[PDB]
Symmetry: D2
Subunit: 237 residues, 4 copies
């Protein structure tokens, strides 16, 4: 029943559901079948960085993903988020594995949201930055297999003692406080998110991916959303 | 049972419990009997601004209160907050009225918290800014008589339709997300808070005050904490 | 010879050079003949707010202008700033009067610029905020008739002792430090500017306007750029 | 003739001028003879981080220096900066070598300054962050042997082609824009600086150190200020 808007880092393409034949970054609006995609030259075992931006004037959701010493990949999609999401939402990170696997490690995550009203100097804002995750992270709602504190990192999916990633795993982390993305008097609403990740797999075909998402505040992991469903969607429709 | 650290803007001095004979700003550490106070030339009906700062290196809690076109009042107290408060806390605003009354209106509130670890570029941070309050403020926990949306403001205590403040009222507003003020690897922890208020009363002796406070995450208004207890303390001890 | 990109608040339309028949907001790219315009319901004597945003991924310059209690005006233009401006630029405010006049008062101005590289956590940033201007503002380059300190405000054009605006006046204020808007390794470059202004005139036809601009670092007021040229352009071509 | 306030990371103690017998961090107020010092367990070849903080209410300059996986060193000194420095200043980094040497590499540098007035919401601020230095850094004033762009870093002292540090070298980098640290209506003025450095030397006795400093805007490297004088002082008095 959840309303999901997500930017996915898809490591394992599922050609049967519309995905192109290569790893890619995509913009999902209420469906795992990305509205827009871009080729992503994913690097197994390297730390990458994803930047997501949006503003209510342009109504364009854009994302850039890069690795040090390499060219970046970019994808954009024209979408009015006020027509898709509710006034109050929660933001988070999600990841999954299935028959194929990979570590879905988050080393840092920052988010800034601003609502500027027509009143003079009337700016509402929220900003959080995690460069370090502790074992008891009270400002995060951890769902599924997600855990914090392992090396000061956030492990979205299960990783065994020896560091090996596990299959059929799903986990998400949402910021505790709801985020206001629309107000009747707002002249401009905008946000920017940044996260660094480490996707590693002993396999030649790692899976399934990581996604930054925005949802209704009471969002929970849908049943059997491991694998291609990224812990965000109930089905492949 | 709550653990309270507060900076109070005391409009009605209670000489019977140690308060000096004039309105004052004070620093309360687990007791309504301020550890330190400073004369405050309170102005009925004018908008004022309070700034509170602290850092774990200096271990000094300081606050400054001012009104436009006037000199400010300042108070400081040497206190190691790690020895008083738990690792995770919630921050908020509290106010009360008793036999004497006043409006306890908050027009804006900002807070910034930073935890810097010994790891290179390892900074965790939280920042929120409210310059406008809407009727349904989901990122705030409103307790007691506190309400939002009235003129885009936060009314900590009850105010009737005609704008007149009510007696025997108590209310608090806490930010939804818990705040991390200590971590084993932190080299410096600091915060700064700023809020603008409007205290107005048709009476010559307005009461009782507004306080910025930090407490255990599950803090609630103590029984019969109206009046001099500022919705923070269970007794005058 | 200067390279100018500007967002103008045009109070006096010059139909002879292409302007629509009403006050408007426009986006100027190296010419006073706006590439794009939008109707602006200017209010004589009221304080307004302008917000300008841009990012290198979307390559879209957008601006929103509003007044309290009123609907806002918005204008956007698709332009790659890297193809127009040099790597290093200076940002500022400009205003002019001619036969017709108005006060071109700036009460506040903020600017944030970010350059994010492909290196992990490699973010360069610049941010300044002026909510108050002092008589000797060393971090601003004042050109022409611009002065600071009058009521803690920045007066872009000459205003006499009695508060009356003067005709045939031109002035600009640029931030002292050059701003970096492009780097070979940058994956995303973005900026946002906000300023509050007070345009007042004893006349029914106030003139000429205020503009936020970006230019080459050594930019100076072109000869005879009073009136319609806004202290930015050498001619009306 | 310059007015200097500095926080030094002294790698080579000069017992003849008062320094303790070990590497240390010190707070210098117009003299190379530190007002206060603290033992610093310097690590040759490791990247460290220094944090400096101050505010006009407490009038206490504090600094913390740390390395990953190690305990930090801290030093504080009670000093009213308004009684030492002029209203407008420039901030920067300085370093030197003499008969003994070391690399004085800066990998990142951030600074935030705030001036809060008694007027409602009257906050002036300046913030810059360098996580990357380019060959032509126009927003920095480089003095002496200082250069940028080498590996995206700032080399305060001369380093040859093969990476070996050179002796008798001195260099400084100041932020281009002057910084306002006092205003007649300011109720609180504060700043915080953070920089990461890499001090490496092929020698067992590296020298001489790095210092974060604040000075009059027109400050220049004093004659023969190599070695123990850190490019900041004209003599050892």
């Amino acid at each position: 029943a959840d309303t999901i808007v997500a930017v996915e880092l898809d490591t394992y393409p599922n050609t049967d559901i519309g995905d192109p034949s290569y790893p890619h970054i995509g913009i999902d609006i209420k469906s795992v079948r990305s509205k827009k995609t871009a080729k992503w030259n994913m690097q197994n075992g390297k730390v990458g960085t994803a930047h997501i931006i949006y503003n209510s004037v342009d109504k364009r959701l854009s994302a850039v993903v890069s690795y040090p010493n390499a060219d970046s990949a970019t994808v954009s999609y024209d979408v009015d988020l006020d027509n898709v999401l509710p006034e109050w939402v929660r933001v988070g990170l999600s990841a999954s594995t299935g028959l194929y696997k990979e570590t879905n490690t988050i080393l840092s995550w920052s988010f800034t949201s601003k609502l500027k009203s027509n009143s003079t100097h009337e700016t509402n804002a929220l900003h959080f930055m995690f460069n370090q995750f502790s074992k008891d992270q009270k400002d995060l709602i951890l769902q599924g297999d997600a855990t914090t504190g392992t090396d000061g990192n956030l492990e979205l999916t299960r990783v065994s003692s020896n560091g090996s990633p596990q299959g059929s795993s799903v986990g998400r982390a949402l910021f505790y406080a709801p985020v206001h993305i629309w107000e009747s008097s707002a002249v401009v609403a905008s946000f920017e998110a940044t996260f660094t990740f480490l996707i590693k797999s002993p396999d030649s075909h790692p899976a399934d991916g990581i996604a930054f998402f925005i949802s209704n505040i009471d969002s929970s992991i849908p049943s059997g959303s491991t694998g291609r469903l990224l812990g965000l969607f109930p089905d492949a429709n």
